Design a protein around this ligand. Sequence first.
Ligand SMILES: NC(=O)c1ccc[n+](C2OC(COP(=O)([O-])OP(=O)(O)OC[C@H]3O[C@H](n4cnc5c(N)ncnc54)[C@H](O)[C@@H]3O)C(O)C2O)c1
Lengths: 473, 418
Amino acid sequence: MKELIYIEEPKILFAHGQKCTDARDGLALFGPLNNLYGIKSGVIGTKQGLKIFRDYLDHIQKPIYNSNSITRPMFPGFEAVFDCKWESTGITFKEVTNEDIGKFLYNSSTHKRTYDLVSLFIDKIISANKNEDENVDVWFVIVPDEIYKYCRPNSVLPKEMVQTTYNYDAQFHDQFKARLLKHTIPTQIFRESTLAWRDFKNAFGLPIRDFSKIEGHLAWTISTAAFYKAGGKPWKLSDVRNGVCYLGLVYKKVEKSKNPRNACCAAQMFLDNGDGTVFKGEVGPWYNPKNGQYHLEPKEAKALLSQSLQSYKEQIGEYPKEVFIHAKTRFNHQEWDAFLEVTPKETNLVGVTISKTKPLKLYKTEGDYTILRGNAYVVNERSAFLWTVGYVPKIQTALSMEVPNPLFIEINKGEADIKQVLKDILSLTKLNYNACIFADGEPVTLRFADKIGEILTASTDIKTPPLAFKYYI
Amino acid sequence: MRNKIFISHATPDDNDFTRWLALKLIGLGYEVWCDILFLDKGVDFWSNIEKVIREDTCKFLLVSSSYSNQREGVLKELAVAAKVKKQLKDDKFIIPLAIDEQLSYDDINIDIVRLNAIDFKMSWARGLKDILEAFEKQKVPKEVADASKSNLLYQQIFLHDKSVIEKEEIYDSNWLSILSFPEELRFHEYNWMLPKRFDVRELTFPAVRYKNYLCTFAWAYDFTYHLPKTETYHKSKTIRIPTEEILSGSYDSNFIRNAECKRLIVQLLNKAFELRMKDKEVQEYEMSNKTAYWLEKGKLEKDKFEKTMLVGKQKDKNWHFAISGASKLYPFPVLMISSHIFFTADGKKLIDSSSVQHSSRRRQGKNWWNNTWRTKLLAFIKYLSDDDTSFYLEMGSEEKVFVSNEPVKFKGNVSYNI
DNA sequence: AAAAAAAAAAAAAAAA
RNA sequence: UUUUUUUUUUUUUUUUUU
Ligand SMILES: NC(=O)c1ccc[n+](C2OC(COP(=O)([O-])OP(=O)(O)OC[C@H]3O[C@H](n4cnc5c(N)ncnc54)[C@H](O)[C@@H]3O)C(O)C2O)c1
């Protein structure tokens, strides 16, 4: 037989120094790290669509019960969880008439219609930000479903409903959050179906997006995102050592310019003088020509890693003692030679590659349940298989539906001991501030890096983008 | 002295609010007694409740809800609380907490109908603030607030019944160990004998052209039929290599490199798997990159191997279990197998629409858990067996590779229970 | 124009 | 785009051989 060693589930710290493996359970009992007095929310959308948002906000003011509390914890209400005040009273509402959205949406050109629809919302948001006295913490952008289902690529407008730009991305969300980057306005896009879906029904009459049993989790993952965007700390990691910066590189394709040009983006995590965690993006997007390189040539590699090290020195004082450059692609020697040069003598630079491609799947002998989450099949000192997706007993179910696929972790460069590499990625899979779940399937460096790349490659006019995730997730 | 707070409620219905309130109050420093708190029960709890109410309780909180309104145990506890209130000469003893909106104040219990209640119906936090303020006003006994007590109690009782436990479990993977390889990899000097504009994928045994050397594990004259010119080839022109050294990694040279000699084995093994599937007379569904093989409706006796069904019906769509095999030499010599589900409308011809195929695959895999994947995968593998313990893939008239029909079993020292 | 061993973009379903 | 997960589609590149 071949041994598989299990890594203890990481604990995330909450208010009053309390630790808990689960984010929802720990947050519902101990509260968040910082005190947000209240969320002055701004609302933009149809006047008809404002009613749905008001109803949902009044709903989440009250406790919400899900089908099986053991599988997923119930929601005790926004104020009970967060100690932060959020009513439907005090929302600044900017009206978007149905005629306005019908003016642009019913167009033959998809890119033109998407650009106009994004401009329609962003102009009102900017006007409210600049020329209105009312202060709003976060702008909830309610979008209808006709716009949603015909404002993304590959959406063919039917001929009977066509009534009547190309430098940008045809995706509403990406372009939307890209064009607001210069103004630094935290926003949260909502579909009318994500909101009170019960009105929207299919042909059979049932809701299309039935969230009847998952209502509590929906409230959990909306309230946490709203709290994060307003400047609140939901939770933090506890087992991360001092002097360890991580950084995660993801390469995205850029189609607006001729040749994909393969922009590179990064997300950075470390600790502070004290105990505070810093999870901020570190993006200066360094474009890489050639169609399928995905390998960053030495000048921009030096730029990326020098920015990463300086952003750590500026906040802690001295250089990280071990940088764990995680990435979803393998490293050829060209980056690492450049990377070594900028790094000092004391810093131990490590490049770790994480992949889901490898087709290994563990099927347990008996029982209708999948492998326990935390098992690591260590192939050797440099490579290993880790099951970040799987069963954890507290949530009563697996994180996946079928038998989950493990993460292929290989220490491509540097030396690093494999146990610590496997013990930090599992820890990283818990800081997904975009969702209030038990744990993530992939480390949040490679996830928030992917998101920040998908947002920063939609607009070419961006310059010195914000590094806070409020403006990205 | 009386320094404990009693919380009456309906046990099978109001666990969520009672749990939240108790775990909050304990963290705030208030001694709390509740039936959901203590883990395990015995016959003694009936007298325990009465003695606690009559001798230790300082405040009696009644969770008022449509369930707890007319619950016999709740009513008995409320009556004992009323008697204790009369005895103690303290009017502000029972503090009802209404948490249900469908329970109007005009339909609450007679023992409560006269009592001012704290409103939890709209916001729980406002109700908790009211509870705390009433407790400081009435000077309820209190200790210094310590959330760690609530954390300890939560870990001890509630994250407690479902925890990591140590007990060894064996796991079944989708990796099939390879028992043996031929002794040597043969580099035939065919040259002009094999036509330059010829395809090696139609030739009988696996063979890939490298430089001017046909890379295969077969014997030199195994390839006479498709290559009639190869009748007069000299066997001394082969550069046969000790394959075991290649797997170890010792061999490397200008002629061939371990990186480029081990990538030529997996192509041979992959084509050999394809040829074995063709020999097994199982059909194929072409995917984006890989070719997967599924079994017809009727080839197996009653469309099932062993006691496990591999072909079934879903309305008019006959779902077919499929596998795909790929060889990787990096970790171990392994022929990995993947699980795939494909659908047919008549049991013989595949549906060409990708959208309906994907939708049907998702709908059918909706309810297939671990045991429904492992069982079918091992059943298909056992159906592919040549013997009781292993099956061979043909790489020559005399050369074969034995691949186990038993997937690589791993071992874990941690597991759990349903 | 093939091969494997590595790559990202995109859409559809189903639970959490 | 509240999420997360699992597939199916294409495409592409590199190292190499003619
Ligand atoms: N604060 C209280 O507990 C309470 C209760 C009843 C009446 N009142 C009073 O009502 C006044 C005049 O207004 P009103 O005639 O509309 O009163 P009301 O009886 O018609 O209703 C007033 C509100 O207090 C009521 N109430 C609060 N707690 C209650 C409980 N435990 N049981 C039953 N009812 C409860 C209802 O919430 C109701 O919304 C007073 O001047 C006054 O003190 C107060």
